[PDB]
Amino acid sequence: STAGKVIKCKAAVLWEEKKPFSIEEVEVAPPKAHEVRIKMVATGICRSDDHVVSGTLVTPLPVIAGHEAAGIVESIGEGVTTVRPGDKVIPLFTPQCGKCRVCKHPEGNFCLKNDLSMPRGTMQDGTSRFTCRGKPIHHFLGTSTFSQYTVVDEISVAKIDAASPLEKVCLIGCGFSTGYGSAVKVAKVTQGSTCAVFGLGGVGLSVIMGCKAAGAARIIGVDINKDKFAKAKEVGATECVNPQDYKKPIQEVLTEMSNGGVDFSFEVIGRLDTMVTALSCCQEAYGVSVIVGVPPDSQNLSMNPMLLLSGRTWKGAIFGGFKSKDSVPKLVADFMAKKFALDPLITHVLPFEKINEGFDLLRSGESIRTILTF
C-alpha cells in the first residue's frame, strides 16, 4: 500500500541539456491538497520533450520531462473531487482551472495557471514532489510523465473511459489532439478547401487527419524527409512535396499548385523560416495560417506585414485550441466510438527503460510516435 507514503520508483531524469536521460530511482512525495498521484501506464515521445534536451525549449533543470501520457490514479489529496483511486487519467500539460479569464472565454484554452510561458518547473504551490540522490527535481508542464509515478494538480488531470487502451489514448495528451484541433478548431478547415501541412511527424499527421475529417479536397504534405510521405498519404494527404526537390522557394511552388494560394496552411515543425513560408503560401486575401511548431527560444522571425494587410490571418495555438479538461474525456470517448484512429501515429512500442533509444528513433527520422510502456 502506497497511499500517504513516499514512493521510491524509477524515472527518467534529465540532469543537463544535450545528455541522455538517466533512468534511476526517485522519491515521489504523496499528493497534497488538490493533488493527484498517478501510476503511469504509457507515455509518448513528443518532439517538444526533445526540445528540452536540445535547448530549443528552456525549462528549469534538472527535470522529469514527459507530457503525453496516460495512467491510473494511485491516490488523491484532500479536496479532490474529479478523479478517484483506480481511475484512468490523462495528465493535462495545459491546465483548465475553470476560474481564469481564459478558461471562462468561449475560445480560449491557454489557462493562466499554465507552466509554459514562464516555466517554474513546479507544482501550482511552487514546490516539487520529486527528489533524486537527495536533490529536488523540477516538474515539466505540471505533468512529468517520464516516471513510474507522478503528482499533478487536479486542474492538470482528466478522468477518461475506464475501458480506454492507455497505450493508444496517451496520444490524446498531446500530439493527436494538438494536430487534429489545429485543423478542426483553430483553423476551422472548410469542406472542399486546399490545405498545406508543413511537417509530417506525429502532430502534422494529426493535422492531416483533421483536415480530411473537415472535408478538405486537397491536403498537400510538405517535408524534407520523403520517407514521411507514404504515411501522410495513408491518413489523407493528396500530394506530398519535398522543398529540396525544387529550384523555387516552396511558397512559390505551393502558390502555383493551388492556383494562387492555399486556403489553410499549418507550420508543424518549429522553424522561423517555415512559419513565414507557411504564411506566404496561403491565399493573400482570405488564407489562414496556423503556427503549431515550437521554434528555438528567444528568436524573432522577420516578415513583411503586407502579407497580412492584403487579408491573411495568422494564428497559433497550444493543444489544438482545446479546453483541456473538458475536451480530453470527449476525445477518448470519440476514439472508443471509432471517430478517429491513433494506430497510424504509432510506429514503435518500447519499454520505458528504452527511453533513450526512443529519442534516437525520433532524432534519426525513423519514428512518428514511440509509445513507452511502464
Ligand X SMILES: NC(=O)c1ccc[n+]([C@@H]2O[C@H](COP(=O)([O-])OP(=O)([O-])OC[C@H]3O[C@@H](n4cnc5c(N)[nH+]cnc54)[C@H](O)[C@@H]3O)[C@@H](O)[C@H]2O)c1
Ligand Y SMILES: OCc1c(F)c(F)c(F)c(F)c1F
Our finding on whether 270 is near ligand X (CB under 6 A) is yes
Q: Say which entry of its own copies, ligand Y, ligand X, none residue 109 contacts (CB below 5 to 8 A, set by partner kind).
A: its own copies
Residues 308-367 that bind ligand X (CB under 6 A): 309, 318-319, 365
Q: Cα-Cα-Cα-Cα dihedral of 163, 166, 167, 169, to 10°?
A: 100
Question: Closest Cα to residue 56, out of 223, 296, 219?
Answer: 296
The residue assigned the cell 495557471 is 113
Our finding on whether 292 is near ligand X (CB under 6 A) is yes
Whose Cβ is closer to ligand Y: residue 29's or residue 187's? 187
Q: Which of 34, 156, 174, 327 is catalytic?
A: 174
Q: Which of 48, 147, 324, 327 is catalytic?
A: 48
Is residue 235 within 8 Å of residue 210, measured between CB atoms?
no
State yes or no: is 48 an active-site residue.
yes
Is residue 150 within 8 Å of residue 144, measured between CB atoms?
yes
Q: Which of 34, 46, 170, 265 is catalytic?
A: 46
Our finding on whether 274 is near ligand X (CB under 6 A) is yes
Q: Say which entry of ligand Y, ligand X, its own copies, none residue 93 contacts (CB below 5 to 8 A, set by partner kind).
A: ligand Y
CA separation, residue 6 to residues 9, 31, 125 (Å): 10, 9, 18
Q: Which residues bind ligand Y (CB under 6 A)?
A: 46, 48, 57, 67, 93, 116, 141, 174, 294, 309, 318
Our finding on whether 34 is near ligand X (CB under 6 A) is no
CA separation, residue 15 to residues 10, 21, 26, 64, 367 (Å): 15, 8, 13, 9, 25
Minimum CB separation of residue 235 from ligand X in Å reads 13
Three-class DSSP category at 48? helix
User: Is 223 labeled as ligand-binding?
Assistant: yes
Task: Please state, in angstroms and rounded to a whole number, the distance separating the CA atoms of residues 359 and 223.
Answer: 20
State yes or no: is 182 an active-site residue.
no
Q: Which of 22, 34, 54, 67 is catalytic?
A: 67
User: Is 293 labeled as ligand-binding?
Assistant: yes
Q: Say which entry of ligand X, Zn ion, its own copies, none residue 199 contacts (CB below 5 to 8 A, set by partner kind).
A: ligand X
Minimum CB separation of residue 216 from ligand Y in Å reads 23
Question: Closest Cα to residue 144, out of 229, 222, 60?
Answer: 60
Q: Say which entry of ligand X, ligand Y, Zn ion, none residue 116 contacts (CB below 5 to 8 A, set by partner kind).
A: ligand Y
Q: Packing angle between helix 355-363 and helix 47-54, nearest 10 degrees?
A: 90
Is residue 209 within 8 Å of residue 343, measured between CB atoms?
no
Q: Which residues bind its own copies (CB under 8 A)?
A: 101-102, 105, 107-110, 112, 117, 259-260, 272, 275, 283-286, 291, 294-295, 298-306, 308-318, 321
User: Is 44 labeled as ligand-binding?
Assistant: no
* 156 CB-near residues (< 8 Å, 6+ apart): 91, 92, 93, 95, 142, 143
Is residue 373 within 8 Å of residue 41, measured between CB atoms?
yes
Binding site for Zn ion (CB under 5 A): 46, 48, 97, 100, 103, 111, 174
Catalytic positions: 46, 48, 51, 67, 174
- Return binding residues for NAD(+): 48, 199-204, 223, 228, 292-294, 319, 369
